């Protein structure tokens, strides 16, 4: 069902009245004045601005930012070197090197990330069958060097032991949807 823009329903007239209105709008600039009035309107309104460090924008529990490995309530880790994160990471960012553990269990020795390559997608927390790795909400980890961003197992563990008071609730809310 098409339409027609920039076209009159028919040929116009040569009425002195229409010519008069045209001349007026060409001289006294009615439309320009209307634009000025609109700017005045928005001037006299409330601005949507906010103070960042003292007010922070809205979000939803499904954010994707700084990373965080996790733990069971019993202190133990959750990663078992299933390598799905490595085989699905579109960027090939992750680097893993696994091993046994003196107690017989299975665990890692190297779980490194390059947050310069990580596009912050979500595939790793989708694949991890144990919800170990969870891309988190923290987006303030800008730095001054390109070596505070090649995170490793211990930095991820610290970030988990730090933010776990928030990721628990976020997931407890989000998991059902998935």
């Amino acid at each position: 069902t098409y339409k027609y823009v920039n076209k009159k329903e028919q040929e116009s007239e040569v009425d002195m009245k229409s010519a008069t209105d045209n001349a007026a709008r060409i001289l006294m600039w009615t439309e320009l004045i209307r634009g000025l009035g609109m700017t005045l309107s928005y001037l006299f309104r409330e601005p949507a601005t906010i103070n960042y460090p003292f007010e922070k924008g809205p979000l939803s529990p499904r954010f994707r930012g700084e990373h965080a490995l996790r733990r069971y309530p019993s202190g133990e880790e959750r990663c078992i070197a299933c390598k799905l994160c490595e085989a699905i990471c579109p960027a090939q960012a992750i680097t893993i090197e696994a091993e046994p553990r003196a107690d017989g269990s299975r665990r890692t020795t190297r779980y490194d990330i390059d947050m310069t390559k990580c596009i912050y997608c979500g595939f790793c927390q989708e694949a991890c069958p144990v919800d170990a790795i969870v891309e988190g909400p923290n987006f303030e980890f800008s730095t001054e060097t390109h070596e505070e961003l090649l995170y490793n197992k211990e930095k991820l563990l610290n970030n988990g032991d730090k933010w776990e008071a928030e990721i628990a609730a976020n997931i407890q809310a989000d998991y059902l949807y998935r």
Binding site: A81, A87, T95, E99
Partner: protein, 145 residues
């Protein structure tokens, strides 16, 4: 196969056996194919492995804590399609797709066992046989592997 299970019921498990310092045994995964049994009773002339029971309670493995060590123990790994009889050294170290399987031979003996050498980030992780219908025929030695 299919796309899901219609099994809303409970599963089973089974004790694990010590069989040697090479062949890590989990035995809640044996689909009971008998490859190990036949391979042993025919090739290695061992005659110690076998099935003990009837019904789901069936198991596969010696009735005692005996050790199945032999110059050819170390191919049941490649033969058991499942990860029940895994290799203890390689275990927990890596996965296949990561690897760059190169191809080589053995020197531990003067036979000429064609071999697949698996790499990982510039390092060896495991060794596999390679099918030569004359020399090694999909079987190689504990030593070389």
């Amino acid at each position: 196969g299919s796309d899901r299970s219609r099994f809303l019921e409970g599963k089973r498990a089974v004790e694990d056996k010590n069989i040697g310092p090479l062949v890590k045994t989990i035995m809640t995964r044996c689909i009971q194919c008998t490859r190990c049994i036949r391979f042993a009773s025919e090739i290695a002339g061992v005659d110690d492995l076998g099935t003990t029971g009837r019904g789901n309670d069936m198991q596969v493995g010696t009735y005692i804590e005996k050790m199945f060590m032999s110059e050819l123990s170390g191919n049941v790994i490649d033969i058991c399609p499942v990860g029940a009889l895994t290799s203890k050294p390689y275990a927990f170290t890596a996965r296949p797709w990561e690897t760059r399987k190169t191809e080589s031979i053995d020197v531990m003996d003067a036979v000429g066992s064609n071999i697949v050498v698996s790499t990982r980030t510039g390092e060896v992780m495991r060794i596999l046989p390679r099918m030569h219908e004359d020399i090694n025929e999909e079987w190689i030695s504990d030593k070389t592997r």
